């Protein structure tokens, strides 16, 4: 048998100025800020 | 048997100016800031 | 048997100016700042 | 049997100016700042 | 049996000017600053 | 994130003679061969 | 992140004569052959 | 990050005569052959 | 990061005569052959 | 980083006569042959 526990702490604060903001806790796909 | 525990601390703050911001806790795919 | 524990501290702050910011706690895929 | 614990301290601060910033705690894939 | 503990201190600060910055705590793959 | 896979192979054969046989793949409770 | 895999091989054969047989792959509770 | 794999080989054979047999691959609780 | 692998070979055979047999691959609890 | 591998060979055979047999590959708890 097997017991599994997991804690993932994700935090972010005080983004005064930003033109493209992308805060993702976990990704398994495609993340694009800008594409043509 | 096997017992597994994991702690992943992710934090970020005070981003005064940035044109492309991408904060990802964990990635298993594709991350692109800009593509054509 | 086997007991496993892991602590991964990821932090970053005070990014005054940056054109491409990519903060990733852990990566197992592709990370590209810019591609054509 | 075997007991495993691991502490990985990752920190970075005060990046006043940078055109391409890529802060990765751990990598097992491809990291590219710019490709054509 | 065997008990294992590990501490890896990674830190970096005050990067006033840099065109390509890549701060990686640990790498087991490919890291490229620029490729064609 | 975390991906977990586990393989537990349990097999037993050729028990010619036995008065009390108790073959359990995994136990988290009480197992008693005989009680009064 | 963390990837975990585990293989536990449990096998037993040719128990010609035994009055109390208790074959358990993994135990996290109480196992008693005989109690009063 | 951390990748963990574990192989635990448990085998036993040819127990011709035994009054109390208790074959346990892994134990985290109480095992008693006989109690009053 | 850290990669961990472990091989634990446990085997036992040819126990012709024994009144109390307790074969445990790994123990983290209490093992008692006889108690009152 | 750190890579860890471990091989623990445990074997025992030909126990013709024994009143209390306790074969444990690894112990981190209490092992008692007889208690009152």
Author numbering:
A (entry chain I), B (entry chain G), C (entry chain E), D (entry chain C), E (entry chain A), F (entry chain J), ...: 1 to 36
Question: Anything the authors wrote about it?
Answer:
For tg-SwDI mice, which harbor the Dutch (E22Q) and Iowa (D23N) mutations within the Aβ sequence, we observed three different polymorphs. The most dominant polymorph, which we call DI1, accounts for 52% of all reconstructed fibrils and reveals a symmetric dimer. The 3.3 Å map of DI1 was used to build an atomic model of the ordered core between D1 and V36. The two S-shaped protofilaments of DI1 are connected through the extended N-terminus. A hydrogen bond between D1 and S26 and a salt bridge between E3 and K28 of the opposing protofilament stabilize the interface between the two subunits. A hydrogen bond between Q15 and N23 stabilizes the first half of the S-turn. This turn is further stabilized by a hydrogen bond between Y10 and a backbone oxygen at N23i−1 in the adjacent layer within the same protofilament (denoted by the index i−1). Although DI1 fibrils also differ from Aβ40 fibrils extracted from the meninges of patients with Alzheimer’s disease, they share a similar N-terminal fold. The extended N-terminal arm of DI1 overlays with the N-terminus of the human Aβ40 fibril between residues D1 and Y10 and with the murine Arctic Aβ filament between E3 and S8. Finally, in contrast to wild-type Aβ42 fibrils, in which negatively charged and solvent-exposed residues E22 and D23 induce a kink in the main chain, in DI1 and DI2 fibrils, mutant residues Q22 and N23 are interior, in extended conformation.
Alzheimer’s disease is the most common form of dementia and is neuropathologically defined by the presence of extracellular plaques containing Aβ in the brain parenchyma and intraneuronal neurofibrillary tangles containing phosphorylated tau. Peptides between 37 and 43 residues in length are generated, with those of 40 (Aβ40) and 42 (Aβ42) residues in length being the most abundant. These Aβ monomers tend to aggregate into insoluble fibrils, the structure of which has been extensively studied in vitro by cryogenic-electron microscopy (cryo-EM) and solid-state nuclear magnetic resonance spectroscopy, revealing a spectrum of different polymorphs. Two human fibril polymorphs have been determined: ‘type I filaments’, which are mostly associated with sporadic Alzheimer’s disease (SAD), and ‘type II filaments’, which are observed in familial Alzheimer’s disease (FAD) and other neurodegenerative disorders with amyloid brain pathology. Here, we determined the structures of nine ex vivo Aβ fibrils from six different mouse models by cryogenic-electron microscopy.
